[model samples]
Target: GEELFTGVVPILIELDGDVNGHKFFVRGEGEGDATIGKLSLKFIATTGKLPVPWPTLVTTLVQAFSRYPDHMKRHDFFKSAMPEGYVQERTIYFKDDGTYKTRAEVKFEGCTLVNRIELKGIDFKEDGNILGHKLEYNFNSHKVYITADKQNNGIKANFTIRHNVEDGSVQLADHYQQNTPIGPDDHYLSTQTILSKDLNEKRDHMVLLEYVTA
Candidate 1:
């Protein structure tokens, strides 16, 4: 006879590492057997700037109107600027000579989220405005790239990011792969045990928790 996961079993998969030059801490949770379809899960992504307080009501109200123009500019620009693949979001405009405008006026963008794979919905945290914008992603399936790679030796992952202004939209893709000797050392604990650890000092490590009955 074989045992399987039930609704009582809690699933937690965490990853802490650097992907595409940015430190990422990913946490995902779901219920029931993962292999079965129609299982929904929520994952939150952060770059060490979350858990902060939201903007003050006064500041929020002020920015609401004060930043309207800037918001509109970004909103309209992203529609056409959004290229294929999980690319970074940025604010940029080209010149007639096919060259960048200027650096002083341009704002560099960074990678967030895990390659935007099978993304269902994105929930922006309120404190996101105060910081760099924390995001929570919803997925209809239990499938996760990070956890899936745990069964393998060499781990590889892609990041959703934007291109550089000076690079001139040449179409860039960033993939992080670890070929080091520090392979995934599966740690086990028993008897209704609960475990969590950074595993590899927060660098290219995937920590997962599973439950079983005896």
Candidate 2:
């Protein structure tokens, strides 16, 4: 006799130790499920000195914008800048005094693909202004990821950004420089769960998951 197994059977796994001095639980399934997922790896604590604030993130954006000297030259620059197999990772901490602490890990195999870039804690803002922007630049794909936090205000930002150098001609709007604060309602109790359900509902055919940092 075959019986159907239905309903959600929750599986919980716990991990201990210091994740920026705050303990965390890395729970999931699958053969190699022990590997940290995006959600757990993304949120990090502040360390060392912090940057000024908005100015720092803005500056990094500007620096990214400057990579393209001319619109017509974008493709060439992108091709040259990111050949293949490149990965870079970095972590930076910003202090209230507008100072910063940084760490980086990067790898590149020729110029077509990026292996990984792992960044930890980065403090990039201070007193409503951005002081510094710590980054991990992947030259293979010409994409850069920045890590920063606003500790003074009890908020932090852990972001993974992707930009194509060949798409540099796009201009940013005037008000784009503002930092849109994440409110209480903006968070998801379990982003992974939400994402998984969404994918199943959408009947997604393929799902490729990878870990860039530990």
Candidate 3:
């Protein structure tokens, strides 16, 4: 009988609570092999900083997870400091500065908080020497939000977590892969979808979630 639940089972937790000062009323999927006894949920605070401390956040999330029926959840469950670990490479064309650089980063390796200082040429001369030096501002990798014009008197938010585990392929957002030109820069007209030639065989899962508020 124990064998029925002994193997790894994928779970999707419907999360609802206030994590930081901001309210978390959205749902998210929990990923990991239930047999391992430890599962982690990756989250993004839509509009503000984390409401509570790390321990407190875990406690609240665990409490919510425990509320589920025993048949739907495992007996042992723990939070992972680093839910996902993977090396991601991205190429950015700095059209504003007429320069580009590729970044090779180790994301979510261990600790949730990782500080990094990137060094690169601020502006290059025709012959490729630094004309001026200034720190470049990069976007936050984890915390991002989307907004739209409001038509209702109330405010609301939604979060959807997309899991990619089949064939070990990384999937990009549908709109992110579009070629429809709309903006001033017309970036969409030149958008590219690049994938790694190597296929991932390991069971390490990747979760992509987007949060929107209005």
Candidate 4:
């Protein structure tokens, strides 16, 4: 349950509203006395829907802050804040500017607006000289950067999302792996697919509901 999506990727979310909500009601076969899913739908389903009546949700979105009625930026359900504690480790360091660092473990939980990321990076305090959290990341921007005390720093990992000129299966501009620092050169990519006109060939023109990608 706690470890269900101990490992996952942004690639899984663009398909539907997101895979987080889907991961919960879905399951495969199981053996007796033990459940089959690495993480079960039950334990993972804790954060269900908006849990609010439409009126209450509307109240938070007020323009009253400065003047006019009021709208709370906090009410943006589809927009997720970076990991809550991200401010604490906004910067980290490695002795070598070229050393690549990566999260030793990563966790994903949420359906976007309600999502969270739990990450633990490798302890790169090779020498006593380096002292800091050593990493920085933002879910909204889909980027991970090395936060070294040294100002010459740059991106550690990055994800670029684009709308394809023509859609089908999303393409990867490049792949990042292991301890490789994804600088300007390395990147992770995602392109829109579900709404692509490219689907018209196989798409059912008469269908009201659809599940598609490019």
Evaluate all candidate structures by whole-model CA lDDT and list the values in order.
0.23, 0.22, 0.24, 0.19
lDDT string, candidate 1, 1-214, tens digits: 0012212223343434232233445455443232221222333454553231111100000000111122233222111221211122111121111111111111112321112211111222233221232211110111112211355333232332222222233222132222211111221111111223354444322222332211
Please state every model's RMSD to the true fold in angstroms.
Answer: 21.1, 19.1, 20.9, 22.0
Please report, as a residue range, the 10-residue window in candidate 3 with the lowest summed lDDT.
181-190
The sequence of per-residue lDDT tens digits that candidate 2 reaches over residues 89-200 is 2233332322222221111233211222222223323222222222221211122222222442221224322311232422111111111111211221111211112233
Candidate 4 structure quality by residue, lDDT tens digits, 39-64: 11111112343211111111011000
**Displacement of the residue 158 alpha carbon in candidate 2, Å:** 15
Runs in model 4 lying further than 4 Å from the true structure: 1-45, 51-188, 193-214
Q: Let me know the TM-score candidate 3 reaches against the reference structure.
A: 0.24
Poorest stretch of ten by lDDT in candidate 1: 57-66
Instruction: Give the per-residue lDDT digits (tens) of candidate 3, residues 128-201.
Output: 11112122111112211222214521112122212132344321211111011111111101111111111342
Question: What is the overall TM-score of model 4 with all chains considered together?
Answer: 0.17
How much is 4 displaced in model 2, in angstroms? 49
Candidate 1, residue 24: Cα displacement in angstroms equals 1.1
